[PDB]
Amino acid sequence: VAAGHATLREHLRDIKAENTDANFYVCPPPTGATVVQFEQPRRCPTRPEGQNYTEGIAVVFKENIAPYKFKATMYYKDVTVSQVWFGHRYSQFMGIFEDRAPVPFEEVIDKI
Amino acid sequence: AYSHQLSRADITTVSTFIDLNITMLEDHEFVPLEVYTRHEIKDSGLLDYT
Amino acid sequence: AWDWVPKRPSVCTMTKWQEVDEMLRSEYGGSFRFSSDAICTTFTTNLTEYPLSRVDLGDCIGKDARDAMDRIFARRYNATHIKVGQPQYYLANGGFLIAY
Amino acid sequence: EVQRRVQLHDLRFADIDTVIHADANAAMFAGLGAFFEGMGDLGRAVGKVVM
Ligand SMILES: *[C@@H]1O[C@H](CO)[C@@H](O[C@@H]2O[C@H](CO)[C@@H](O)[C@H](O)[C@H]2NC(C)=O)[C@H](O)[C@H]1NC(C)=O
Numbered sequence: 001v002a003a004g005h006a007t008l009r010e011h012l013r014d015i016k017a018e019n020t021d022a023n024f025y026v027c028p029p030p031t032g033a034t035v036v037q038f039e040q041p042r043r044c045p046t047r048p049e050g051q052n053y054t055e056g057i058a059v060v061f062k063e064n065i066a067p068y069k070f071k072a073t074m075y076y077k078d079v080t081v082s083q084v085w086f087g088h089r090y091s092q093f094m095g096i097f098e099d100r101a102p103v104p105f106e107e108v109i110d111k112i
Numbered sequence: 113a114y115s116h117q118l119s120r121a122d123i124t125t126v127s128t129f130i131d132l133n134i135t136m137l138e139d140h141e142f143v144p145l146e147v148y149t150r151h152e153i154k155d156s157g158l159l160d161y162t
Numbered sequence: 163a164w165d166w167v168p169k170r171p172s173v174c175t176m177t178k179w180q181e182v183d184e185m186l187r188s189e190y191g192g193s194f195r196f197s198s199d200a201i202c203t204t205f206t207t208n209l210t211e212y213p214l215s216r217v218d219l220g221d222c223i224g225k226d227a228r229d230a231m232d233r234i235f236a237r238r239y240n241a242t243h244i245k246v247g248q249p250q251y252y253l254a255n256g257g258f259l260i261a262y
Numbered sequence: 263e264v265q266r267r268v269q270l271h272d273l274r275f276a277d278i279d280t281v282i283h284a285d286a287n288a289a290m291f292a293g294l295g296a297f298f299e300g301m302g303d304l305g306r307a308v309g310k311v312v313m
Pocket residue numbers: 132133134
């Protein structure tokens with residue numbers, strides 16, 4: 001009878017309707033603060049050449065650089081200047097000047 | 113401009129096909145000021161297929 | 163336009179998709195997780211076995227499963243392993259029925 | 263070679279783009295701006311009008 005087939009469609013349809021959701025990722029562009037390199041292909045013998053061959057277990061150790069990660073805050077003022085005294089319709093042709101300057105300590109402590 | 117020359121041992125080689133205990137940062141771009149004024153193009157490394 | 167025809171006769175609800183010689187079952191987080199080298203997908207399921215007997219009244223899936231398992235067992239495991247008990251049926255996430 | 267040619271094409275576009283947008287009027291205004299700026303405030307008073 002079809003009742004068995006019908007309930008089986010129902011169970012399969014139900015199970016595939018379940019939420020199996022995953023997160024999105026905002027990937028910020030790397031600045032080059034951390035860099036890695038890869039292994040390279042290497043030429044090897046066409047015929048065996050080594051002597052005293054032996055099997056064995058090995059444990060490889062690397063130099064411990066012990067990275068210390070911490071939080072740092074940076075403060076700066078971006079300045080921009082243009083020839084406004086000629087009028088907005090013309091200042092555009094005379095270019096623009098820009099500079100990035102550090103915030104003096106007294107401003108970081110007494111104002112920020 | 114040319115700066116200096118590193119030995120191949122100066123950079124951390126990533127293990128063959130799977131690696132762990134690797135340290136990283138949440139890189140923050142800090143774009144140059146000229147990208148807003150002069151609207152010069154920001155370096156984006158070598159081109160991916162995408 | 164198309165030529166009309168009477169509705170086709172009914173067919174079995176499920177088709178044999180894969181025959182897997184090596185499939186490891188493991189219990190974790192209150193769920194079974196099946197994995198193999200032949201299929202890169204991992205199948206997740208509840209610990210309860212599905213009551214297929216009261217659904218596959220025509221024994222369609224039953225016959226296909228029992229025959230395939232015996233063929234594989236005779237071909238590759240006959241002289242190296244023993245079968246523990248009767249086959250088990252599990253409804254895995256994604257809508258698959260795994261006979262184990 | 264594909265990525266080498268792609269980087270050559272966006273360079274050709276930048277040159278064509280510059281040729282279209284490098285207005286001779288803007289070049290003249292830039293020259294006049296520098297001339298009046300060098301004359302100080304006496305230059306600003308006139309510059310604002312002649313512009
Ligand atoms: C860094 O290396 C250590 C081993 O030196 C890893 O430590 C294991 O971590 C798991 C998950 O917490 C534990 O179940 C194990 O008991 C740990 N092993 C030991 C010997 O303590 C650690 O996972 C690595 N960290 C990263 C981020 O890769």
